Amino acid sequence: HMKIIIAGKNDIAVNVTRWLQKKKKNIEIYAICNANDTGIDTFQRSFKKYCKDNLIPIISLAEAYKIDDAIFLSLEFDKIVQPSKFNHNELFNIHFSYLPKYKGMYTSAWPILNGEDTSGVTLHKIDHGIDTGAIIAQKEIIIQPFETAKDLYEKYISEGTSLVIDNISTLLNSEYVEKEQNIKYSSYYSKKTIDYSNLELNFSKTAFEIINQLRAFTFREYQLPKLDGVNIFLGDVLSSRSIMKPGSILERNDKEIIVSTIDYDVVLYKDNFKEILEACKYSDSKYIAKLIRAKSILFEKNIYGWSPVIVAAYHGNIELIKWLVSKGANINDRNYKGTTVAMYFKDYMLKSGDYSGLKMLIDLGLDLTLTDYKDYTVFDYLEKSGNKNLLQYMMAFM
Amino acid sequence: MKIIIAGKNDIAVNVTRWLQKKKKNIEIYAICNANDTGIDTFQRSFKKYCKDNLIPIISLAEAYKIDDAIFLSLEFDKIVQPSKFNHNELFNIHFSYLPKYKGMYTSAWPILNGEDTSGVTLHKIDHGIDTGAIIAQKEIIIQPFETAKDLYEKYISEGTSLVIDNISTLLNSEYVEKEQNIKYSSYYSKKTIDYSNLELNFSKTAFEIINQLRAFTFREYQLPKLDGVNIFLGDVLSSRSIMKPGSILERNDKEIIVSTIDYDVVLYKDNFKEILEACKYSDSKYIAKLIRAKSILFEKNIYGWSPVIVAAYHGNIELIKWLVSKGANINDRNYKGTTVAMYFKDYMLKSGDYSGLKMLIDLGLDLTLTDYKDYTVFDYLEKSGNKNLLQYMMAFMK
Numbered sequence: 001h002m003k004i005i006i007a008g009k010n011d012i013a014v015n016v017t018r019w020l021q022k023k024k025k026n027i028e029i030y031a032i033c034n035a036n037d038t039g040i041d042t043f044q045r046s047f048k049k050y051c052k053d054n055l056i057p058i059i060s061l062a063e064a065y066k067i068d069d070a071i072f073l074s075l076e077f078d079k080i081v082q083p084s085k086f087n088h089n090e091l092f093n094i095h096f097s098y099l100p101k102y103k104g105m106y107t108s109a110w111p112i113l114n115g116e117d118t119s120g121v122t123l124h125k126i127d128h129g130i131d132t133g134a135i136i137a138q139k140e141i142i143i144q145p146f147e148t149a150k151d152l153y154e155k156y157i158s159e160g161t162s163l164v165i166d167n168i169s170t171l172l173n174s175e176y177v178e179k180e181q182n183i184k185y186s187s188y189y190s191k192k193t194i195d196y197s198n199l200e201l202n203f204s205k206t207a208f209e210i211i212n213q214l215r216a217f218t219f220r221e222y223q224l225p226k227l228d229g230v231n232i233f234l235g236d237v238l239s240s241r242s243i244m245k246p247g248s249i250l251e252r253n254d255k256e257i258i259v260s261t262i263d264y265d266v267v268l269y270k271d272n273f274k275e276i277l278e279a280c281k282y283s284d285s286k287y288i289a290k291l292i293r294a295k296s297i298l299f300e301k302n303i304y305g306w307s308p309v310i311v312a313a314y315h316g317n318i319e320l321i322k323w324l325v326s327k328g329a330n331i332n333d334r335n336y337k338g339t340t341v342a343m344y345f346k347d348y349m350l351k352s353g354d355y356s357g358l359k360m361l362i363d364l365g366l367d368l369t370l371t372d373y374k375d376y377t378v379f380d381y382l383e384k385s386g387n388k389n390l391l392q393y394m395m396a397f398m
Numbered sequence: 399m400k401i402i403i404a405g406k407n408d409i410a411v412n413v414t415r416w417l418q419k420k421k422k423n424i425e426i427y428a429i430c431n432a433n434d435t436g437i438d439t440f441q442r443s444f445k446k447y448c449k450d451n452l453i454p455i456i457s458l459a460e461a462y463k464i465d466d467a468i469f470l471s472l473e474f475d476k477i478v479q480p481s482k483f484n485h486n487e488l489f490n491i492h493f494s495y496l497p498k499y500k501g502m503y504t505s506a507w508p509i510l511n512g513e514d515t516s517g518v519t520l521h522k523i524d525h526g527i528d529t530g531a532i533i534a535q536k537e538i539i540i541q542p543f544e545t546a547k548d549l550y551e552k553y554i555s556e557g558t559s560l561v562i563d564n565i566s567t568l569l570n571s572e573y574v575e576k577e578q579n580i581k582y583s584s585y586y587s588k589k590t591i592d593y594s595n596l597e598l599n600f601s602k603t604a605f606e607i608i609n610q611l612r613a614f615t616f617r618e619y620q621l622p623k624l625d626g627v628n629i630f631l632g633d634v635l636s637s638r639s640i641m642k643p644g645s646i647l648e649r650n651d652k653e654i655i656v657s658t659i660d661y662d663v664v665l666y667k668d669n670f671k672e673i674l675e676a677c678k679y680s681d682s683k684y685i686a687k688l689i690r691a692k693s694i695l696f697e698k699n700i701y702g703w704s705p706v707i708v709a710a711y712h713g714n715i716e717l718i719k720w721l722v723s724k725g726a727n728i729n730d731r732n733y734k735g736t737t738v739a740m741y742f743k744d745y746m747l748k749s750g751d752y753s754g755l756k757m758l759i760d761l762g763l764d765l766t767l768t769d770y771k772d773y774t775v776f777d778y779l780e781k782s783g784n785k786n787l788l789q790y791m792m793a794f795m796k
């Protein structure tokens with residue numbers, strides 16, 4: 001007979017809540033949404049939409065203060081919570097850093113900017129201050145030297161979810177231990193510290209710092225870094241050192257811009273993502289591999305959620321998908337409605353007549369049991385459509 | 399052999415002294431910095447040293463035309479162009495552990511960033527800023543309480559020994575170069591801190607604020623100010639005010655308590671002038687009440703008078719025992735190299751009270767030390783004709 005208030009947004013609020021509904025069947029859940037939650041799924045799920053679709057009441061923070069015998073759990077929530085205004089003190093938060101480092105804002109960029117190898121997530125209490133409350137549990141996170149602010153954000157979402165999950169019984173049962181945050185090594189960045197409205201690359205810096213500025217600001221659904229009009233998608237460092245003033249453009253071609261820094265010259269790769277996506281329809285390994293500078297651009301997505309594997313799978317392109325997957329791409333990658341590669345390869349199989357591919361993708365680890373966000377498998381869509389031919393063929397693989 | 403020393407302060411002077419002693423036959427040419435006044439201050443004037451010792455002072459343009467010489471820059475202020483020499487025996491001491499902290503304000507930035515360590519590096523002068531290949535380096539530990547001035551002093555001392563330990567290899571071409579790493583390379587230009595408009599930022603953690611204080615505590619240039627009131631360090635409390643960061647919570651004659659992003663901070667108002675005045679005659683009990691930050695006891699006025707020196711000159715033995723216990727140097731010098739023993743002897747001379755000498759001798763007072771004129775205390779006594787004092791001091795000398 002418990003109550004929990006979940007205040008926040010995105011896949012973390014969604015996936016924690018999914019877990020609570022399945023695992024704590026009889027808990028009453030109340031939700032608070034963030035101001036900019038459009039109730040529509042984008043590269044993150046809408047928490048508002050999830051709650052509507054799954055009969056979770058949506059309340060105000062004002063209304064939530066007046067609840068008794070409820071845990072409060074903030075998951076990338078956007079409004080200051082004032083502990084005094086509840087009748088208890090069971091107020092909790094996931095913050096996307098290894099506290100007490102990187103309190104405050106832009107924790108997907110700042111660590112990268114500062115040349116960190118690691119970050120973390122932290123479960124702690126909400127007290128009056130900004131990420132000041134006592135720590136309950138933490139998990140260290142490795143940042144690979146190629147990963148972007150988006151890859152890091154995605155690790156935070158994943159690990160933050162898991163961490164809430166490994167501790168939520170102890171929050172609900174008051175069975176948890178806390179410890180006050182240390183003084184030493186504490187750091188905080190306000191909203192002022194980056195003006196995302198007015199981004200500017202600083203070339204009076206080292207190659208390392210410049211590469212890290214690129215990584216820090218590479219989060220496509222918001223922005224890419226820009227050099228004199230042109231969008232950039234990562235870069236590299238050369239062994240040469242230009243005598244030219246830092247910022248000086250040494251070379252330009254259609255794929256890359258080379259620039260002088262405080263030490264080593266840096267190559268900045270022009271963003272060719274749309275172009276790589278058009279090509280993924282029918283071109284082959286050779287041609288695509290010739291288009292690619294930063295390997296990770298194969299895992300990027302447009303506003304619909306379409307990655308290269310997805311567009312390829314939708315157009316038949318079997319030899320590409322094999323190579324994409326050898327490059328580390330996900331054979332069961334999904335768009336922003338939960339739609340899987342398998343489901344894309346369906347529309348082709350249907351429109352072509354050629355089912356000789358399907359076993360190829362199965363060897364590669366394709367999974368037919370997967371459902372989208374309306375709980376529908378590929379088998380459900382085929383049944384619905386009347387394509388018992390295609391249906392029965394596919395059922396053979398089970 | 400021949401050598402060109404280009405730079406300023408005790409590092410230039412003391413490297414040069416070592417060469418005059420231990421490499422008699424090398425010819426030495428000197429380049430001075432543009433703000434070397436010729437008058438010794440908290441750092442010696444290299445200019446003065448050179449004029450006093452008949453070392454010729456030349457320009458960088460003249461330096462380029464000297465073959466048969468290696469070039470060694472020591473906190474030098476002018477851009478060196480390697481293509482204008484007819485050789486490549488060009489070396490620098492930079493005050494950081496490269497490839498980190500290239501560029502400016504190296505006694506400030508590492509402290510600002512919460513570093514536990516820094517270093518000094520010996521490397522080649524290349525076309526860029528602090529970019530040339532490394533020859534040798536040494537780690538420096540930054541103690542938690544040390545200020546920017548303390549770290550500068552460590553840089554000067556350690557930079558000096560790094561040169562001394564390597565200079566034969568430089569002169570003999572037995573040294574080994576290795577190009578700087580890309581990874582972890584950092585750089586701070588002159589625009590990163592504006593010493594004309596220093597403001598403390600209280601939208602930061604208590605750690606970050608104490609480190610702001612440390613970083614800006616370099617008395618010869620400035621102290622940090624809160625409301626035009628000079629501050630000499632501070633401490634963190636265990637309370638955390640709800641008030642907005644920067645809200646002053648408590649004032650008194652001695653300190654100012656402020657809200658930060660996490661824990662409250664005490665800023666100590668600077669009272670060094672008052673402390674130095676009181677050391678003439680007051681006892682340890684009175685000075686103890688006056689002290690907040692213990693390191694204020696090692697500070698100096700424009701003459702180079704520290705507490706221990708003022709106490710010596712007034713025969714304040716009881717206070718000297720305490721200061722030493724506190725960490726003060728028993729052989730502390732003013733900016734003319736005049737030692738505590740030289741000041742004590744003036745007190746013994748005027749007063750006729752000699753009893754205190756043994757105590758100071760037992761605390762490690764060193765009577766062999768020379769000032770920047772190569773005079774010992776005994777040379778002063780022989781010149782004044784004071785034999786009885788000479789003999790007495792000599793009798794207690796260990």
Ligand SMILES: Cc1cn([C@H]2C[C@H](O)[C@@H](COP(=O)(O)OP(=O)(O)O[C@H]3O[C@H](C)[C@H](O)[C@H](N)[C@H]3O)O2)c(=O)[nH]c1=O
Nearest residue numbers: 076077078095104105106107108109153196219222223
């Ligand atoms: C606003 C913005 C964000 N980003 C990136 C960097 C951020 O780490 C990431 C997420 O942005 P965000 O607006 O969610 O804000 P963050 O600063 O990441 O998180 C703060 O704001 C949240 C609502 C939470 O209260 C969180 N506890 C706060 O630390 O998106 C951009 O690349 N461009 C942008 O223009």
Ligand SMILES: Cc1cn([C@H]2C[C@H](O)[C@@H](COP(=O)(O)OP(=O)(O)O[C@H]3O[C@H](C)[C@H](O)[C@H](N)[C@H]3O)O2)c(=O)[nH]c1=O
Nearest residue numbers: 304305306310311312314335337338339343344347381
């Ligand atoms: C990948 C891809 C998709 N499309 C199409 C297919 C869709 O009708 C439309 C929007 O795609 P979407 O990712 O929003 O797909 P969804 O609406 O998520 O999934 C539907 O379309 C799939 C192909 C299956 O039919 C599935 N069972 C449907 O529920 O654009 C292209 O035109 N070019 C493409 O390269």
Ligand SMILES: Cc1cn([C@H]2C[C@H](O)[C@@H](COP(=O)(O)OP(=O)(O)O[C@H]3O[C@H](C)[C@H](O)[C@H](N)[C@H]3O)O2)c(=O)[nH]c1=O
Nearest residue numbers: 473474475501502503504505506550593614616619620
């Ligand atoms: C100028 C200035 C310096 N300082 C401190 C911080 C500095 O690290 C330290 C020394 O000052 P400085 O003018 O020598 O400048 P730094 O920036 O330390 O050294 C640079 O300039 C030198 C001439 C050398 O070329 C060196 N390689 C450079 O990095 O004193 C202040 O506290 N207030 C000040 O206004």
Ligand code: NA
Nearest residue numbers: 241242260261
């Ligand atoms: Na360059």
Ligand code: NA
Nearest residue numbers: 588591592593
């Ligand atoms: Na400046």
Ligand code: NA
Nearest residue numbers: 639640657658
């Ligand atoms: Na506060």
